[PDB]
């Protein structure tokens, strides 16, 4: 089985730039409902082992709030796959988005966000994963 769901561990009050927009999230972890099967975690990125279509999704709890999902292929710069944007009026702005994407062996994917208004790493409120579809 090829699948992964990694948890955001929180230990609340948490734009863009040339190559990648927002700031990359790397505080996930492989006791919080997160696992790794035929995929691993490194530098806060999901490294692909098997080539195939993958339904990638991410929920970032914000507690211009835009969530990004990049892929690092055999190409110098990060390739943006999906982007979920929101704008506030306290606040509650969870953001879920997913989509099927073709990946090659060694492709690394990561989540990026605009900290426009805090991000809560509740292992239940903020996760990142993907799985092989066929």
CATH class, range 1-134: mainly beta
Nearest residue to 45 (alpha-carbon basis) of 101, 84, 6: 6
* Two tokens, residue 76: 């110098």
Resolution number, Å: 2.8
Q: Which residues contact 90 (CB under 8 A, 6 or more apart)?
A: 63
The answer to the question of whether 89 is labelled as a binding residue is yes
Distance of alpha carbon 34 from alpha carbon 26, whole angstroms: 14
Domain residue spans in the chain? 1-134
* Two tokens, residue 1: 């089985």
């Amino acid at each position: 089985r090829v699948a992964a769901h990694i948890t955001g561990t929180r230990g609340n009050t948490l734009s863009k730039n040339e190559k990648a927009l927002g700031r990359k999230i790397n505080s996930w972890e492989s006791s919080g409902h997160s696992f790794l099967s035929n995929l691993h975690l490194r530098n806060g990125e999901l490294v692909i082992h098997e080539k195939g279509f993958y339904y990638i999704y991410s929920q970032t709890y914000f507690r211009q709030m835009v969530q990004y999902i990049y892929k690092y292929t055999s190409y110098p710069d990060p390739i943006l796959l999906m982007k979920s944007a929101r704008n506030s009026c306290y606040g509650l702005y969870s953001i879920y988005q997913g989509g099927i994407f073709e990946l090659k062996e060694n492709d690394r994917i990561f989540v990026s966000v605009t900290n426009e208004h805090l991000i809560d790493m509740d292992h239940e409120a903020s996760f990142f994963g993907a799985f092989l579809v066929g």
